[PDB]
Amino acid sequence: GVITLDPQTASRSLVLSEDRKSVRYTRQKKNLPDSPLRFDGLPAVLGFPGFSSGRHRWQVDLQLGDGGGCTVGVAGEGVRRKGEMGLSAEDGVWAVIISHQQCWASTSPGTDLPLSEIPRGVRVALDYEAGQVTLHNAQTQEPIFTFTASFSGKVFPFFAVWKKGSCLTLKG
């Protein structure tokens, strides 16, 4: 199922590609119009569509710039869009944060992940009725994390990326 990046949610710190399948961080903010839906404080963007039911999978390839990082997972539709405050599963973000030496799951408090290696891609699997979000290393199949939750209403693919040279690209 085709997932794309939703420009109407994208932080001004994010440049979506013309095909809306990739996104890079920009130090110079884009002139995106103000909206209550738009991330402002975190360099984040939702996917489209969101999901109310069923099993869904997608893959995110990632490149990090110097001192860079990204966040890959899922977010409840009610996720706060405004402020610089880090989001966690309390805020309805179930994601892994990847940086050059250190990856962590967005539990509350956060879980440091002792991975064989830093991923260069992440496979996300949502099972809405099972209340599970599973993350694997897309290339090696190393398990990264499994979140267990009870979902109500729509759950969206969630992405964030930061520092120059950092970028994400969606695959099937």
Numbering used by the authors: 294 to 465
Recite the paper's sentences.
The tripartite motif (TRIM) proteins form one of the largest subfamilies of RING-type E3 ubiquitin ligases, comprising more than 80 members. TRIM family members typically contain a RING domain usually catalyzing ubiquitin transfer; one or two B-box domains mediating protein–protein interactions; and a large coiled-coil domain region, which is involved in self-association or oligomerization with other TRIM E3-ligase proteins. About two-thirds of human TRIM proteins feature a PRYSPRY domain, also known as the B30.2 domain, in their C-terminal region. All characterized family members shared the same overall PRYSPRY twisted β-sandwich fold consisting of a 7-stranded and a 6-stranded antiparallel β-sheet.
In the TRIM15 crystal structure, a reasonably pronounced pocket was observed, with a solvent-accessible area of 83 Å2 and a solvent-accessible volume of 46 Å3. TRIM15 lacks the arginine at the center of the pocket seen in TRIM10, which is replaced by an isoleucine (Ile390), resulting in a substantially more hydrophobic pocket. There are two tryptophan side chains on opposite sides of the binding pocket (Trp397 and Trp455) that provide hydrophobic docking surfaces. Trp397 is conserved in TRIM10 but adopts a different conformation in TRIM15, pointing toward the center of the pocket rather than outward.
